[PDB]
Symmetry: C3
Subunit: 114 residues, 3 copies
């Protein structure tokens, strides 16, 4: 399935906390999408962010994979919102998520495609 | 009367202050709300500082990823004009060094506050 | 008129100069493999904190987007970027994911307008 999470968040957090978020994100991907964690990936990007016209700690989480998302979107949102709430104090009302299934031909990994 | 949930992820490579980045995020959300037509409480924006190039040269540039649950069809031109005027005014980025993408998402692929749509 | 773009999110500890070199080479790769002139090839290099397989390690995610012109070139594109990131940033091929997306022109904005 090759799940990936690009997490763009604007909290003032330590680098350690960013690493813990990346770690928990890969665990979340494996547990909810159901694949072995060795193929789960995550990048955490620090941003300057706003929600509803206000500058507030917030996030956008871009989930992409070679299928495996259909029906699992709700569970992933609840896990990620609890995580960013727990590690960065970001409110659920200030987090957007996106889920996108990609065909193998448009998925690159280790010099090749699927 | 119809909920659209617009988002703009702005990746730009200008040398600008954090305050100017906040102003960009703020104006971006106003632009989204005014042009896509939704209440601004549902418009969101993240500004990401990058190292960037255009046309083989290293130059002030940006990539603006606009996403929503519909509401984009026909509004892309107006959005391109307002964002290019914004990044030019605040960061000095030329219109010829900004790319934008527009993507309409189905509700089931949109997460918010522990649930989906 | 393909307008290729590469958004490179990588978590290596590299200099700003090296990041410019990656962006510079990225546009050349776009121009050479998609077959277009480089004047419309564009790239952003974004520094992240990243992991692969539950561990924190240098890794990358590469978002390749254009108005078509990708169909069939993805294999070649993955090979060049994986070699580029290995050579300039020491990132292993097994810690790089890539995505390819063809956009219709009406959903492609540039210089105050669309296509």
């Amino acid at each position: 399935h090759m799940p990936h999470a690009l997490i763009t968040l604007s909290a003032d957090i330590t680098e350690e906390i960013k690493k813990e978020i990346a770690h928990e994100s890969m665990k979340i991907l494996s547990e909810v999408i159901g694949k072995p964690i060795s193929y789960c990936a995550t990048q955490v990007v620090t941003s300057v962010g706003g929600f509803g016209g206000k500058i507030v700690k917030s996030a956008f989480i871009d989930i992409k994979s070679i299928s495996g998302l259909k029906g699992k979107q709700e569970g992933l949102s609840d896990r990620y919102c609890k995580l960013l709430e727990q590690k960065a104090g970001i409110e659920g009302g200030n987090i957007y998520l996106n889920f996108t299934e990609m065909t193998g031909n448009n998925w690159g990994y280790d010099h090749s495609t699927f």
